[PDB]
Write a protein that binds this ligand. Structure first.
Ligand code: NAG
Ligand code: NAG
Ligand code: NAG
Ligand code: NAG
Ligand code: NAG
Ligand code: NAG
Ligand code: NAG
Ligand code: NAG
Ligand code: NAG
Lengths: 108, 123, 363, 247, 99
């Protein structure tokens, strides 16, 4: 089970960081995927291999691993970013991809 | 790659229901068409995968035996099927095409593309 | 010279003390300029993969292959290379690369190595005893193992005779283990020959799955298509260079050849069965390869009683190649003064030439 | 498929191979040397089976075969290689048809008397069912002229370490009824990366009969001493096991 | 010399062996005269949460020479772009902490 703060908020043009805590079972092995769910839309691959970014994705999004916790940084926040930001990783104890508790970013 | 899944269903408890996940625009016979639940306004839960090519099945612990997920490689469409529909089972059910290559030994499972889901209402 | 004889006194004579050799000044690397990325990643990336009894094979060809990714990887449990070493794999070009792929059990990973024995090695997949390749294995216990036990992967437990190297057996015949004909249907002493093993996520490392992708690199002599990611340089002729022609490496002087190579021939060999000619992989020019000029070095000297002045003879070396310079049939003699006066032979030079100290050294 | 039954049944004929069937054993240039190599070669003065009718029964393929045809109107079409040749096992079909050369290692359901027909080409009756194809290659399209002999094609068919190797030589010929005496070497044509099990072979020919004949010989493990000329061409050879003198 | 290696890697700390530990962290000379004494320190140096104090250098420009200690903290660029000396794509700390 990946643990995430229930909300994040900041002024547009700032940089916002989101935490995602886990154990050594799940994040111990190259797993910090990130997908956002904008209202009424399906998630799609937005960060893979901890930080790698797909072609088709805005360049301002960069995250990284902090041990057994994940970290996502939206630099130069904009309006459209009200998207439920999901950190994912698959536990490895009985397998199973687990999504974090989800963070609803509010722009101020 | 434009997986066109299904519409929206409203059904009563105890009935049997089938959600199709139609694949198109890619080699649907060789990729994992896994499933994910999303209760209204909550986090995404993984459910399980099916390999249409060999009908191999995988489940999360919260679903193994609660949902029976199958595939149809001839028509290129994978099926999530309920043994028994339940009251709480209402959710926004997506189907995404997963990969699980080792990328030179680093295991990954990233749901690259997603359908528009299936809002299943129980009453 | 004093060092050669391990003495501080040197007698009159000629001593062979070293070897002169012109050193290469350039590194000439020529590979086909086919920069299409080689699909190695797809053999490892493959979502599926075989079973040991029927081991999938991909023949990878016509591509530029980067092996840094394999070595720099931080994930492989076992990266054992027989005949070649991973770091130096980038330098060479291979005629053909085969990528067998299959899911073995953990205890059995040792078996998929040259000249090893066991069920997997004898009746499922046998690595040739002269294997040139890399056995790349990882702990695939979290992809190919299910709670209930995956059975898709089949290993052939019993065979009539051991499997020959790189032979695939897809036979489904029922194996009789008694004198009775078993009759081709199950019964006592009739059983299916592929026995399906069952993995669960929490099994011990002995029963944990270790996927393997043996890369059987073929080094036979022929046109070479799969290659290292090395960059090529301009071709330099009539100079001492270090060359690398499609995996063929050495030091020498490249000159234009008059040999009529046939369209299929890629390089040549001398009477000694050593390489003496190469077809450039980018322009179909036939080059002759000679070693860079070399020869023995002899020191012509009066004894340490008389003089510390010496002359040096470069044996079978031209005086235009080495950098009182006297060119003779025996080689280039520097430091001895050539005179028109003959005398009795004192210190032999060769080809009729002798030297003496008469004061200075003369030839 | 159609089963052709109007064929006379006579025993096979035999002839003398003389010194034919020598090929370039490798891909490395060497010259003015004598090289001793152990490989599958056609023995000197061996008995080569000689066929014309519509003569093409099924024949054995053992270690490898030497094949030669004498033709004036491109009667030879190709070969079928396999274990059963009836879609029960993997099979190889090589056909040089009116439009291209096709090499396929698909699972074919072959006819029990496969052939092409023809001066223009018309009939193609080689196989019916064909699926689960693993390798295919098609040569750049060209038109073959289908109408003493003039064209000699020699083939050696080997199946070694995953490769199907085809050797060939094209020369003029002028005999009516035999294989020439003299020496020539078969150059490599193509390296086919096909791991196909080859153990039996049949000849494809293209109502009336034409003027043609073909020869089938067999290779054996032998040591040969090969003579390379100034240009790296194999110009002579010694069969080390033929007689005490060659040894 | 004293250090805490991982179990699978114990084989690497032997003469003429290869791996991450052997190449970029500690290399035993090929002519080693010595004894490699190792014990199962899984109950002293491992914590429930994962000890991070022990760092192994995952990537180096070139292999470590025998009995050479690298204390470098330079950021390792793995692309043509200068990574710029701060983290980003293809800039990462070179000592990756195992847990
Ligand atoms: C690459 O090699 C081919 C040989 O087939 C040659 O035609 C082509 O010009 C070469 N490319 C360059 C950039 O030299
Ligand atoms: C398959 O290999 C390609 C090329 O190396 C790579 O880009 C891709 O990520 C691999 N597949 C997956 C699911 O990542
Ligand atoms: C060289 O000197 C030694 C003594 O130092 C003497 O015995 C010997 O005869 C001398 N030889 C010549 C050729 O001068
Ligand atoms: C040295 O080189 C010149 C030409 O550069 C040639 O005429 C001469 O014969 C050479 N001498 C030897 C000993 O090779
Ligand atoms: C030897 O005599 C010739 C005259 O023919 C002269 O040219 C040459 O220079 C003399 N030798 C030397 C080393 O000068
Ligand atoms: C080839 O073998 C057969 C076997 O019966 C024999 O009759 C024949 O004479 C042999 N060779 C020749 C050249 O006839
Ligand atoms: C496809 O190949 C398999 C070989 O495993 C064979 O059993 C099967 O019958 C083939 N398909 C058809 C339609 O013949
Ligand atoms: C080819 O098939 C035959 C069965 O007729 C078998 O005896 C032979 O060993 C097979 N060849 C190979 C290389 O497996
Ligand atoms: C070598 O080839 C040339 C043509 O390039 C030819 O004239 C000559 O006769 C050949 N030599 C031999 C021995 O066949």
């Amino acid at each position: 089970v990946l643990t995430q703060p229930p909300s994040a908020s900041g002024t547009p043009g700032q940089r916002v960081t989101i935490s995602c805590s886990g154990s050594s079972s799940n994040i111990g092995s190259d797993h910090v995927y990130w997908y956002q769910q904008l209202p009424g839309t399906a998630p799609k691959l937005f960060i893979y291999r901890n930080n790698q970014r797909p072609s088709g994705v805005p360049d301002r999004f960069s995250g990284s691993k902090s041990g057994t916790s994940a970290s996502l940084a939206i630099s130069g926040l904009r309006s459209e970013d009200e998207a439920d930001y999901y950190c994912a990783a698959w536990d490895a104890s009985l397998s199973g991809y687990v999504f974090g508790t989800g963070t609803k970013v509010t722009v101020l | 790659v434009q997986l066109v899944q299904s519409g929206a269903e409203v059904k009563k408890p105890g009935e049997s229901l089938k959600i199709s996940c139609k694949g198109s625009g890619y080699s649907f016979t060789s990729y994992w068409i896994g499933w994910v639940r999303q209760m209204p306004g909550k986090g995404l839960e993984w459910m399980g995968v099916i390999y249409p090519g060999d009908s191999d099945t995988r489940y999360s612990p919260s679903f193994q035996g609660q949902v029976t997920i199958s595939a149809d490689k001839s028509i290129s469409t994978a099926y999530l099927q309920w043994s028994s529909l339940k009251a709480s089972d209402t959710a926004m059910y997506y189907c995404a095409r997963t990969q699980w290559g080792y990328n030179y030994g680093s295991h990954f499972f990233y749901m690259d593309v997603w359908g528009k889901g299936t809002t299943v209402t129980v009453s | 010279t004093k060092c050669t004889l391990k003495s501080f006194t040197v007698e009159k004579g000629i001593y062979q003390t070293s070897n002169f050799r012109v050193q290469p000044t350039e590194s000439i690397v020529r590979f086909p300029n086919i920069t299409n990325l080689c699909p190695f990643g797809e053999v490892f990336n493959a979502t599926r993969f075989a079973s040991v009894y029927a081991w999938n094979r991909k023949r990878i060809s016509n591509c530029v292959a980067d092996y840094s990714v394999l070595y720099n990887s931080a994930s492989f449990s076992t990266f054992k290379c027989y005949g070649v070493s991973p770091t130096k794999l980038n330098d060479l070009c291979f005629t053909n690369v085969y990528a067998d792929s299959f899911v073995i059990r953990g205890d059995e990973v040792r078996q998929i190595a040259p000249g090893q024995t066991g069920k997997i090695a004898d009746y499922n997949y046998k690595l040739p005893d002269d294997f040139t390749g890399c056995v790349i294995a990882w702990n695939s216990n979290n992809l190919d193992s299910k709670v209930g036990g995956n059975y898709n992967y089949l290993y052939r437990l019993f065979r009539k005779s051991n499997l020959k190297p790189f032979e695939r057996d897809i036979s489904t015949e029922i194996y009789q283990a008694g004198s009775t004909p078993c009759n081709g249907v199950e019964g006592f002493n009739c059983y299916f020959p592929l026995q399906s093993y069952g993995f669960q996520p929490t099994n011990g490392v002995g029963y944990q799955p270790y996927r393997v992708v043996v890369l059987s690199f073929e080094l036979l002599h022929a046109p070479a298509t799969v290659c290292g990611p090395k960059k090529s340089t301009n071709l330099v002729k009539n100079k001492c260079v270090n060359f690398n022609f499609n995996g063929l490496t050495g030091t020498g002087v490249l000159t234009e050849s008059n040999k009529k190579f046939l369209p299929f021939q890629q390089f040549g060999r001398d009477i000694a069965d050593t390489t003496d000619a190469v077809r450039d992989p980018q322009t179909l020019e036939i080059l002759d390869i000679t070693p860079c000029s070399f020869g023995g070095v002899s020191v012509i000297t009066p004894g340490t009683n008389t003089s510390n002045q010496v002359a040096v003879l470069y044996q079978d070396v031209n005086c235009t190649e080495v950098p009182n310079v006297f060119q003779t049939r025996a080689g280039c003699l520097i430091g001895a003064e050539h005179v028109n006066n003959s005398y009795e032979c004192d210190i032999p030079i060769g080809a009729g030439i002798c030297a003496s100290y008469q004061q200075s050294i003369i030839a | 498929c159609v089963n052709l039954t109007t064929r006379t049944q006579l025993p096979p004929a035999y002839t003398n191979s003389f010194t034919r069937g020598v090929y370039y054993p490798d891909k490395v240039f060497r010259s003015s040397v004598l090289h001793s190599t152990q490989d599958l070669f056609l023995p000197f003065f061996s008995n080569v089976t000689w066929f014309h009718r519509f003569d093409n029964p099924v024949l054995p393929f053992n270690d490898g075969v030497y094949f030669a045809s004498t033709e004036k109107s491109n009667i030879i079409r190709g070969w079928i290689f396999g274990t059963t040749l009836d879609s029960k096992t993997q099979s190889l079909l090589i056909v040089n048809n009116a439009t291209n050369v096709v090499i396929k290692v698909c699972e074919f359901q072959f006819c029990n008397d496969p052939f092409l027909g023809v001066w223009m080409e018309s009939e193609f009756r080689v196989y019916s069912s064909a699926n689960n194809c693993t390798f295919e290659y098609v040569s750049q399209p060209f038109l073959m002229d289908l109408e003493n002999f003039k064209n000699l094609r020699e083939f050696v068919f080997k199946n070694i370490d995953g490769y199907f190797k085809i050797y060939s030589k094209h020369t003029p010929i002028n005999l009516v009824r035999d294989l020439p005496q003299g020496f020539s070497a078969l150059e490599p044509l193509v390296d086919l990366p096909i791991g196909i099990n080859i153990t039996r072979f049949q000849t494809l020919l293209a109502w009336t009969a034409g003027a043609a004949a073909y020869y089938v010989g067999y290779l054996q493990p032998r040591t040969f001493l090969l003579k390379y000329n100034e240009n790296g061409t194999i110009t002579d050879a010694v069969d080390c096991a033929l007689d005490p003198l060659s040894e």
